[PDB]
């Protein structure tokens, strides 16, 4: 029988691989079911068997597939010195991503780095790292956060494959996951409203679970679904007593710092 699951090519540029790691924390479905039954994951450096020229051949076979493919991009694009500070198989990352983007059925940027540039773009940006859209002038479906919840990434992939392009906000993020502020769903909101704040991490107020706004919490300016869905089915940063860093916002490394202040 002639069979085909939609081809996904996943590229790693200037990244920490935390987005790949987040993706494999999915439980609806688990990652094995996704790659056995739903997609054909045709290039993925972190987990693929082929290496070297065999891996590069697998990439080319996927990019030339007659059925087309979806492109997932993890990491920013380092552009300084002709793109040479980030290379795979002797090719600048920006060159390979440009080529893959040009024929992709759709482009999903997993993480703040591919969506907006991320940690390596933070001032003074030694490698002149750029987000994918910033570098290439192409529209992308952005699944940001550092890393995003697998619920948001796998949810977006499944949506793209079964329903179409989900409604995106002005930062390219699906409203399904990014339509609400972290703060608006935070269980510490009743403390915030009552101006009940922890003045320090050692304080009795912190022990009592008071709001973390005075300690820098960016929940009020950050669009994500963290308190609603949790991470790892168990926790999220504020529940663990720590302020939100704003990690799903563009350029947060520069716009949300200092992290323990309200700048």
């Amino acid at each position: 029988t002639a069979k085909h699951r939609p081809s996904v090519v996943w590229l790693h540029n200037a990244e920490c691989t935390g987005c790949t790691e987040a993706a494999i924390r999915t439980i609806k479905p688990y990652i094995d079911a996704l790659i056995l039954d739903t997609i054909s994951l045709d290039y993925q450096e972190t987990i693929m068997a082929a290496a070297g020229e065999a891996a590069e051949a697998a990439l080319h076979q996927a990019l030339e597939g007659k059925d087309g493919y979806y492109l997932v991009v993890e990491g920013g694009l380092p552009t300084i010195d002709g793109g040479q500070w980030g290379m795979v198989a002797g090719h600048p990352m920006i060159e390979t991503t440009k080529k893959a983007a040009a024929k992709a059925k759709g482009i999903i940027c997993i993480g703040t780095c591919s969506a907006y540039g991320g940690v390596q773009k933070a001032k003074p940006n030694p490698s002149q790292a750029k987000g994918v859209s910033e570098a290439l002038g192409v529209k992308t479906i952005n699944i940001p956060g550092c890393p995003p919840n697998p619920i948001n990434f796998v949810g977006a992939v499944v949506h793209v494959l079964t329903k179409g392009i989900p409604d995106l906000d002005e930062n390219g993020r699906p409203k399904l996951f990014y339509g609400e502020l972290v703060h608006d769903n935070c269980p510490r909101l009743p403390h915030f409203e009552a101006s009940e704040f922890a003045p320090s991490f050692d304080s009795e107020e912190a022990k009592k679970g008071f709001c973390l706004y005075e300690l820098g919490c960016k929940g009020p300016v950050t669009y994500n679904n963290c308190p609603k869905v949790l991470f790892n089915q168990v926790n999220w940063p504020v529940q663990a007593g720590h302020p939100c860093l704003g990690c799903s916002e563009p350029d947060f490394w520069d716009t949300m710092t200092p992290f323990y202040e309200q700048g």
Binding site: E21, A22, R25, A51, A55, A58, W85, P124, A206, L245
Partner: protein, 545 residues
């Protein structure tokens, strides 16, 4: 019984090295089927040390954690230890306990995924699993591991059927162009062992979700934890009964998988590849230790780490030397940095990027070359294992001897790619054996004391160092504070030690040395290069930062 080896003479380049973190190009020269020279060429620079200059020292841990999301947490921990040292704060006992448990959880998650999802495909021919008799495989599994339903013939057959449907679909996905397709002389396992390992590879994808959920009870989330602050931790809930009960339950499930699947699979694989106990060795080992009972200073960390610190040189297990933090430096001679940067202790670190060209053997990596008293040092599970074994650490003596007896090999056989792989499993079993004790310690401490963050003040000018032994080895972060801001922040990371380039004297790094003598059965499918490189568990985002 001879190790397969071609007569190939010529160059081999493997780029990308897949099934590692980050971007690595390996070049080797081969003569008569054995590697005679090697280069470890890291292919991405980000420049986190540069980015940190002038920033708030409190922010460092959030940036440096993004050095890597495979070894998530560990850089937040090293940065936190570093700033704690710089501000001269001693964290409360509960914060030491919580930080060290989150490290333990990370070791379990990271080593399980490494063995199955990164390394196993170098030893296991997945397609050969389709040829196995599942009843024979179940009988074998019953002889080499505890009884478990996932090892039943019915369960193994269900795995075979899934894999058969996938292979016959025409879309091989992550197995496209695998080195084992069509058969490969360097792959030794019986089909039944391939099937058992492949079944466990799939189970491990589910079990690593549980290992990450355990870690997140204390860490806030995984990847990229968010529970550490200057002076300790923020997670008061993680000191309490129900969360710690759930953390114990999840950790027990994970450890059951370590003991039932990881260790028996590792020993089965090792038994068939005993020749690999004579390939891939190095001679010098460094650890800063981890799981300390006193983390009030870097010196106390070194002295009181339950996985002890130390230095071994020349394979001499009769002597372990104390770590001198003043003796660490990094070279850049063979790296993509400006001339003039050799011999820098990390408090005097300089990160001045200067690219030349691909395969310039005078400058071939974005990693610096860390050296210790003039020598390259291997770091990671094998370093920790030899240091602990040499010192008579009782858990390492027990578990190492178990493995030596099962395989009928001496401790010296561990100076090898097989040994490096075995050590990773050994220490995973030992972390498992200690989880209940460490959890009870923190549960009893958290029940009587909710001090989790100490008070502190930012100094105008100071310096400090944070040490950790992360899953890949000796990690250190080094800060100079001036004007209450970061004046210099230098990371020296385990994959920097293991996979950096040559040092100022032209001396090969541990992976470059380990690659000398590698046999190559088929130069078009050089799985033997991957076996050794993967055994070091490389992380290039870590190594370069």
């Amino acid at each position: 019984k001879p190790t397969p080896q071609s007569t190939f003479t010529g160059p081999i380049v493997v780029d990308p090295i897949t099934r590692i973190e980050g971007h690595l190009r390996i070049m080797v020269e081969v003569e008569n089927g054995k590697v005679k020279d090697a280069w470890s060429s890291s292919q991405l620079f980000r420049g986190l040390e540069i980015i940190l200059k002038g920033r708030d020292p409190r922010d460092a841990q959030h940036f440096t954690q993004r050095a890597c999301g495979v070894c998530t947490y560990v850089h937040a921990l090293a940065s936190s230890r570093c700033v704690d040292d710089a501000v001269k704060v001693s964290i409360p006992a509960n914060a030491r306990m919580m930080r060290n448990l989150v490290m333990a959880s990370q070791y379990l998650h990271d080593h399980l995924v490494h063995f199955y999802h990164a390394h196993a495909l170098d030893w296991v021919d997945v397609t050969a699993a389709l040829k196995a008799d599942p009843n024979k495989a179940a009988k074998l599994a019953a002889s080499i591991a505890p009884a478990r339903p996932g090892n039943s013939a019915k369960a193994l057959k269900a795995v075979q059927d899934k894999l058969k449907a996938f292979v016959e679909s025409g879309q091989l996905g992550i197995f496209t162009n695998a080195y084992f397709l069509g058969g490969h002389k360097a792959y030794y396992l019986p089909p039944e062992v391939d099937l058992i390992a492949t079944a466990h590879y799939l189970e491990a994808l589910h079990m690593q979700v549980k290992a990450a959920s355990a870690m997140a009870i204390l860490g806030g989330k995984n990847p990229h934890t968010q529970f550490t602050v200057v002076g300790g931790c923020s997670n008061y809930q993680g000191l309490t009964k129900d969360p710690l009960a759930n953390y114990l339950a999840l950790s027990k499930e994970v450890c059951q998988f370590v003991n039932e699947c990881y260790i028996p699979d590792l020993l089965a694989v090792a038994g068939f590849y005993k020749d690999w106990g004579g390939i891939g060795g190095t001679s010098n080992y460094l650890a800063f230790g981890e799981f300390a009972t006193d983390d009030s200073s870097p010196e106390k960390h070194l002295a009181t780490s339950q996985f002890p610190s130390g230095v071994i040189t020349g394979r001499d297990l009769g002597k372990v030397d104390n770590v001198d933090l003043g003796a660490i430096y990094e070279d850049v001679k063979y790296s993509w940095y400006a001339p003039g940067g050799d011999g820098k202790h990390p408090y005097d670190g300089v990160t001045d990027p200067k690219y030349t060209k691909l395969d310039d053997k005078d400058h071939y990596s974005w990693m610096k070359a860390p050296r210790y008293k003039g020598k390259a040092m291997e770091v990671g599970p094998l370093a920790r294992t030899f240091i602990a074994y040499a010192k008579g650490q009782p858990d390492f003596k027990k578990v190492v001897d178990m493995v030596l007896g099962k395989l009928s090999v001496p401790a010296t056989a561990l100076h090898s790619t097989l040994g490096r792989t075995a050590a990773r499993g050994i220490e995973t079993a030992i972390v498992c054996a200690n989880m209940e004790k460490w959890i009870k310690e923190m549960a009893d401490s958290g029940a009587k004391d909710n001090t989790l963050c100490a008070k502190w003040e930012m100094p105008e000018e100071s310096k400090g160092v944070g040490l950790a032994d992360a899953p890949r080895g000796a990690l250190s972060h080094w800060i100079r504070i001036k004007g209450k801001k970061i004046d210099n922040f230098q990371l020296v990371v385990p994959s920097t030690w293991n996979l950096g380039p040559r040092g100022a004297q032209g001396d090969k790094s541990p992976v470059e040395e380990a690659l000398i003598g590698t046999p190559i059965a088929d130069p078009k499918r050089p799985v033997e290069i991957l076996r050794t490189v993967h055994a070091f568990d490389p992380c290039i985002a870590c190594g370069v930062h």
